[PDB]
Design an enzyme around this catalytic site. Structure first.
Site, short mmCIF file in Angstrom:
data_model
loop_
_atom_site.label_atom_id
_atom_site.label_comp_id
_atom_site.label_asym_id
_atom_site.label_seq_id
_atom_site.Cartn_x
_atom_site.Cartn_y
_atom_site.Cartn_z
N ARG D 237 0.84 -1.19 0.00
CA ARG D 237 0.00 0.00 0.00
C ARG D 237 0.88 1.25 0.00
O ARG D 237 2.05 1.21 0.38
CB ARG D 237 -0.98 0.02 1.18
N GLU D 266 -2.72 7.92 -3.41
CA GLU D 266 -3.90 7.09 -3.19
C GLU D 266 -4.42 7.18 -1.75
O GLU D 266 -5.59 6.87 -1.52
CB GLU D 266 -3.60 5.61 -3.50
N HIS D 293 -1.90 0.22 -9.83
CA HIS D 293 -2.68 -0.54 -8.86
C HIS D 293 -3.32 -1.77 -9.50
O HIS D 293 -4.52 -2.00 -9.38
CB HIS D 293 -3.73 0.35 -8.18
#
Lengths: 329, 326, 329, 330
Positions: D237, D266, D293
């Site tokens: 992430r 993000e 992603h």
């Protein structure tokens, strides 16, 4: 010196007795401390004196790591986890049964106060309106009447010995009978349980010898009792079904109810009430209640406190205490 | 120091408790000693802890002239001659009834074990041939079914309270009803004995509140494919009638903690559990009188008898006394 | 008439229900057929009722060119290649989850049978040597004990509802909490997984409301558990390290292990044994096992079978079946 | 009269036909995220919603859509849902199981191989038309014999180690919770500390660990601890990596390269938020390798995520308990 925590008030001579061998943390009040406060005090105590409100489980013991003895000022150990105490190396001691005579005397007190309208009598005096004898508050006497003692344990015996001089008709039921010499000296007569309920003006449940069931005085037992009878319960809160007692009072089956104990005191039953029913509380004309005063006599409280203190002193000194019910290490 | 004889095994903590005030002669095994060996140990004993196999009669007392207290690790005293003990100056004590809750939980264990074929299940696993789900050992569920408790004494009430969460239709029969609060808390509906036998998928006999058996006539009144679970006492169920009903399909299963061969105090009595039942591994589930066989409960029964003994030897009135000696 | 092949036994009323609309080729035994036999029967089949042992891949479908619907008698589809079914023009249907209550009930069955030594007891009865009560097979009771439910999904909720009347201390852990009215009704208290493992006499893994975890009861978890504790696994094989449990049983950390599910039946991971470990199978004294009987009650099996059959009947009639998880062709 | 289901993002056509049997489907026919205002407008009279990661289901959203009975999230988590509000509004909220682990591991290895072997610059040289055979150019770093540390042995970290086990590397990992004895041996992985992993690794691959949620673990301080000329592969992430520290460490030679599938821009629901990917990273095509992603962007996985979400919606609309429910409404 080791430290001993006392969760409830004791007589100053008990504190002095303990003070020679220990630093004492008393409860100076007559109130029950919250559990968190008992634990905060007992957290570094070597010894605890426990009373009826105390509940000793393993969570309690895990927060009290120095504890070596719990001297209960109690004749039994329902609210103690005895094996938890054993595993934690904690002596658990009790005292002998000293409640018998003061409980029999108070039972006779509840009987007399209830049948003679003595509480309503006192309220009339305090009102300031007393102006002499009046044809009011006619009650029920003892002489010539029939009283039934349900169960002839030690309390039942102590009542019979005391009611022997009152010229009553005394009946009792029990799985095991009294000796012949006691039945003659107390003029008490053994009968069955259905007969006792059937003939008695006054029904007095004591603890029977042997065993047997819960709610000894339920709706079925009340229906067999004589109309206009009185029920006096200084035995145990579980003995009487209070809600059935409310209905029996409303319909005239019962003339009155006196009790020193209540269903809300049974921390063993799950189907358990949290207060004394307000219909009983309101009915001052036909009820006489006391707050578990069965053994509230100075000389007996002192002796119960001294035996609990002696057990604590013994255990702290390294001995097996006289009232031990376990063996820890 | 006084001498206490223990006729049956007790936990080591109880032996230590008694050892502080007496010399203890324990039964170090899990067996019942013959009466001859019990009497020989108790001959010069000051106290005895007695269990169910002990028959304390006049002869026994005459053989043990030093006895001052018999602490029965029992709730009843059928095997004790109370008046003989009184005349020989021997305290006779009992313990309160601590059997109710372990007995009710074992009854539910038997119910689930029998209805779910759990014993045959375990044997399929031990056999080594398990390879995943199969369409085998389909049993009977509890939810939606009708269960009858015959008698609402203490055990019967402890069963109802525990089955209250299982979404069954719970019935009971008893001469004395429960109060409205118990009936609604446990969702148990009072019916007659005949209605219970007629309507119930499961029949659970218990001790009633105040003082009939499951014989061939009672079995014929039950629902075809019902189960019978007997953890009450051996005399309440006719085992050969149950054998016949298992064979005919009247009963789908029979589970028991108690057996006819246990009723010593009645002349008509079998010597064993019938081979037809022991052999019916598919439809039966049995335990050897394990009703109160939980350690926490056994320990307290032993502790109360021990405390009764310690009190008498120190000259007090023992808390469980049922007589008045001398 | 279309042909429907049933890979496993079904109740005769399911056969009757399907016969109205198709010729039925049943598995008359309680055995699983070898794949080659399933294929040889399905080769000319328009429909198939599949069960947990079946494994539907493209190679299977290629060998059954008339197949129009697979009616899975299962709530899931891990053993089916869904999009291969789609590509081959084959409807794939499942059934709703009907397993919760019979699984919860058996879990309590396993708890009682394990803690009360009921298997050993039954064996002692069958040996013929029973001669009345003996001080033998002393087990562990429920009342007063602490039982923890790890995961409050549907099965966990059903267990807590059923244990609510047993007067235990009920704990549970879950990232999604129960609501206050359920904690109150069932007397179940939320805690963390570490709290649960440290405090519980009985540990019962269930499916959580939401989490992704494989092998939660491992050597580390068993180290945190109370000595002499019991573990009951009716959840799935991946939940408990069975080798870890053998060691904890030998060392005394666990008093017992009961399970309805086993690691050997996991087919979504390759490093899997295909036997239950002999050390577990041999320890009849401390274990209690059942062969995936969690939903083995007639009423649930029948309704699972009827829903699968209705799906087959619908799809064969040209309708979209109610249980469809795909859209074929 | 058929209930209405709104799908906020594109789904495979099979899923639409599956839903159509019991509902009227309002699909997103584009591959774009619709503005929240357009989502709300479509869902206002909907009985069901299929939510994706951009959807933020708060009290305001539920109050705008009073007929909603189920939200089928094609997601494994619920950080963007007010679970209690859904419950109070009588709306089933459902999730799908974690299906992202294996494709994220595969992609992570793809990023590692593409970065270390200069495969993107290599493809650029092919497209230029100038290829005339082998040249002593684009010399890279191999895998065999090298040291690679996985910072976190969650599900993704475990799937990576299993796949890298045949590559004959020296695999290290750090995690507050170890891997028991057996996995550590089948995969040839050895537990170390974080400071030791950073010091010794040619390649650093952060993944999500078990239990301990520690913050921003790879900033300028952590990059200063890494071996000079190391490569960093971030696909778990966007918060675990300070991208301006990476720009600096690439310019100084501390990092040989940086590959990522996730980016700081993000991170919405955390106050730390740049709007773009730093231009210094975008311009550095010789030392970086980026994907938008795509961790779980394999057709077969997306179809199954959508299928489970649809089934949850079909179940709830039928009056059943949906299999992925995380609440009990009303």
């Amino acid at each position: 010196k080791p430290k001993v925590v006392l969760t409830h008030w004791v007589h100053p001579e008990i504190i002095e007795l303990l003070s020679a061998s220990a630093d004492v943390i008393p409860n100076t009040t007559r109130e029950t401390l919250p559990r968190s406060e008992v634990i905060a005090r007992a957290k570094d105590a070597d010894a605890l004196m426990a009373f009826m409100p105390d509940s000793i489980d393993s969570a309690f013991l895990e927060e009290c790591p120095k504890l070596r003895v719990i001297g209960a000022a109690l004749k039994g150990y329902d609210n103690f986890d005895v094996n938890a105490c054993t595993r934690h190396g904690v002596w658990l001691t009790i005292v002998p049964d000293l409640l018998t005579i003061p409980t029999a005397e108070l039972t006779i007190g509840l009987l007399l106060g209830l049948t003679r309208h003595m509480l309503e009598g006192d309220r009339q005096i305090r009102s300031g309106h007393f102006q002499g004898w009046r044809p009011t508050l006619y009650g029920s006497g003892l002489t010539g009447k029939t009283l039934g003692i349900r169960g002839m344990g030690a309390v039942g015996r102590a009542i019979a010995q005391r009611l022997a001089g009152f010229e009553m008709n005394l009946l009792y039921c029990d799985r095991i009978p009294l000796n012949a010499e006691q039945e003659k000296a107390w003029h008490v007569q053994r009968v069955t349980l259905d007969e006792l309920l059937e003939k008695c003006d006054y029904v007095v449940p004591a603890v029977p010898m042997a065993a047997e069931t819960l709610h000894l005085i339920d709706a079925t037992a009340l229906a067999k009792m004589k109309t206009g009878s009185y029920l006096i319960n200084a035995c145990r809160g579980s003995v009487v079904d209070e809600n059935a007692v409310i209905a029996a009072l409303a319909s005239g089956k019962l003339a009155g109810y006196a009790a020193d104990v209540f269903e809300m005191e049974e921390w063993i039953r799950a189907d358990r009430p949290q207060a004394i029913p307000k219909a009983l509380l309101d009915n001052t004309a036909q009820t006489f209640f006391t707050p578990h005063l069965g053994s509230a006599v100075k000389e007996v409280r002192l002796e119960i406190e001294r035996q609990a203190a002696m057990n604590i002193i013994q255990a702290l000194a390294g001995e097996k205490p006289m009232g031990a019910i376990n063996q820890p290490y």
